[PDB]
Amino acid sequence: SRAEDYEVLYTIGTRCQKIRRKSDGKILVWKELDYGSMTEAEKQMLVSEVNLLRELKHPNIVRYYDRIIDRTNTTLYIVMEYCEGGDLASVITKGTKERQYLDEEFVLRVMTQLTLALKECHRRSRDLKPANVFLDGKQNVKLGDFGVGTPYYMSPEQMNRNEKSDIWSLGCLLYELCALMPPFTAFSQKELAGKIREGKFRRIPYRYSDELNEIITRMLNLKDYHRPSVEEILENPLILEHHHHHH
Ligand SMILES: CCc1ccsc1-c1cnc(N)c([C@H]2CC[C@H](C(=O)O)CC2)n1
Numbered sequence: 566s567r568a569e570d571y572e573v574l575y576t577i578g579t580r581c582q583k584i585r586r587k588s589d590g591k592i593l594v595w596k597e598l599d600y601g602s603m604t605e606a607e608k609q610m611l612v613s614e615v616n617l618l619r620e621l622k623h624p625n626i627v628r629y630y631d632r633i634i635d636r637t638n639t640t641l642y643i644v645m646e647y648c649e650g651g652d653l654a655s656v657i658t659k660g661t662k663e664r665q666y667l668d669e670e671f672v673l674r675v676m677t678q679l680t681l682a683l684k685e686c687h688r689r690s691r692d693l694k695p696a697n698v699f700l701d702g703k704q705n706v707k708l709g710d711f712g713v714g715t716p717y718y719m720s721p722e723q724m725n726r727n728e729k730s731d732i733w734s735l736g737c738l739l740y741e742l743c744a745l746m747p748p749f750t751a752f753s754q755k756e757l758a759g760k761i762r763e764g765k766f767r768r769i770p771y772r773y774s775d776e777l778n779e780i781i782t783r784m785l786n787l788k789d790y791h792r793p794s795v796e797e798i799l800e801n802p803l804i805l806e807h808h809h810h811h812h
């Protein structure tokens with residue numbers, strides 16, 4: 566459609582902005598992309614890429630609504646859902662500061678809702694990292710598209726040379742949610758690789774049940790074939806109706 570149909574309220578991060586649709590005042594978000602300096606090839610990839618985004622409809626995946634071309638300032642806007650809770654990275658960062666651990670109930674919601682997101686991605690065949698996981702205003706958890714640093718979540722196989730690879734990464738993410746730090750830490754990737762191949766890490770804090778520790782521990786198995794599948798994860802007695810998405 567057209568940018569004039571929306572009013573920017575303010576910038577979230579750098580560009581992403583919270584916006585209001587004029588027709589009904591609905592609160593949304595858009596992402597600004599300046600293609601002015603792109604080749605025709607880069608733009609064709611962009612077109613198809615954006616095309617695959619409109620296809621994905623799922624409660625646990627950030628919903629995209631529209632693409633908007635402003636050829637005058639060579640900007641493409643991708644209009645999406647507003648997730649008022651922000652991203653999971655900030656939640657973990659915050660926890661670290663106030664030295665306050667997250668509730669097991671929140672960890673179970675994230676496990677449940679991200680596992681369902683993964684199942685969808687696999688079916689239709691995204692980076693499983695805290696910075697790419699978003700919270701809305703009704704306790705729902707949503708996977709985003711994006712989709713120098715140390716690769717904390719790289720799996721043993723995807724580090725030598727797989728859907729069980731996603732399970733490892735989810736393990737790393739839930740582990741980091743609980744402990745406020747990743748299972749494996751190191752100053753260089755080589756040292757990191759060293760620690761991963763060993764497959765050893767601390768138990769998540771004792772405030773968390775043995776059942777939660779067990780499942781996260783399984784996801785962190787060195788053998789992908791010992792890691793639980795999406796199906797096996799959701800059969801876990803920990804996971805209850807209220808841990809799923811609600812409108
Ligand atoms: C409180 C708003 C906030 C703070 C940190 S992130 C964030 C927010 C809120 N709603 C959103 N829809 C999003 C995005 C960012 C861009 C993203 C992507 O790269 O595709 C989708 C989710 N962030």
Ligand SMILES: [Cl-]
Nearest residue numbers: 663664665666
């Ligand atoms: Cl602490």
Ligand SMILES: [Cl-]
Nearest residue numbers: 768769770771
């Ligand atoms: Cl501990």
